[PDB]
Amino acid sequence: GKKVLIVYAHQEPKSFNGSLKNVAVDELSRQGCTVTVSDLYAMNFEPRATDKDITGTLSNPEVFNYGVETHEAYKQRSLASDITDEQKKVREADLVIFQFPLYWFSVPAILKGWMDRVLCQGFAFDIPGFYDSGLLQGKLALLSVTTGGTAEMYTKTGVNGDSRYFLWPLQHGTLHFCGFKVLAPQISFAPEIASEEERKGMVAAWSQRLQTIWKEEPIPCTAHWHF
């Protein structure tokens, strides 16, 4: 029995991202996996890191330090309930899939705010106590990204450089740092300009890949792999 969390960041259910999320839900449910979706836009998830993230009185209401106040609120079980709800989902999950369109070589802001606010000190890592002494060791993570640009543009001598260059902040800087073993990204290049059949083939390849997700070897999450 496995638990899967899909963190999903798209405004439109009929979008190509919506269909990739629905095909993941379907296929992992088919396999008997325990599945949970965090549909950030439908939840109107708060992306801003503010003092509202700590309930009751602040540790030092004079100089506000976000990392510090959230660390202490975590330990003392005082974080806002939107955050702690996400952390419970993350704690129980064996695999976390993030499904999102690429926005500026990165995640949409709503998802960036999820990472900023949910993966707090004390939950995802301590200082020190990161990368391999990172508190989410044993969990798998997988980025499933859709792009505007074609796969050619994302070659190391393309205009955009190699896909693996933009992955560094997300795979290594965030997911590895927290202790995740990181599975190879799923990149669905440029669905808006692919045919309705190349689009089926991308959705089907995702479905097909999810069939054997649990047999997969994690990538070596190193400078060399990305660069």
CA separation for the pair 34, 51 (Å, rounded): 34
Is residue 181 within the footprint of Zn ion (CB under 5 A)?
A: no
> Annotation-wise, does 183 bind a ligand?
no
Is residue 175 within the footprint of Zn ion (CB under 5 A)?
A: no
Is residue 161 within the footprint of ligand MZC (CB under 6 A)?
A: no
> Annotation-wise, does 154 bind a ligand?
yes
Tokens 């009751």 correspond to 56
Burial class of residue 185 (count of CB atoms within 10 Å of its CB; 0-12, 13-18, 19+) = middle
For residues 202 and 221, which CB has a smaller minimum distance to Zn ion in the complex?
Answer: 221
Is residue 176 within the footprint of Zn ion (CB under 5 A)?
A: yes
Alpha helices (runs of H) in the chain, residue ranges in sequence order = 16-30, 66-75, 81-92, 109-118, 163-170, 198-210, 223-226
Q: Which residues bind ligand FAD (CB under 6 A)?
A: 10, 14-17, 19, 63, 65-67, 101-105, 116, 146-149, 173, 191-192, 196, 199-200, 203
Which among 178, 148, 185, 180 has a CA at the least distance from the CA of 164?
185
Is residue 121 within the footprint of ligand MZC (CB under 6 A)?
A: yes
- Chosen from ligand MZC, ligand FAD, Zn ion, none, partner binding at 172 (C-beta under 5 to 8 Å by type): Zn ion
For residues 147 and 186, which CB has a smaller minimum distance to a second copy in the complex?
Answer: 147
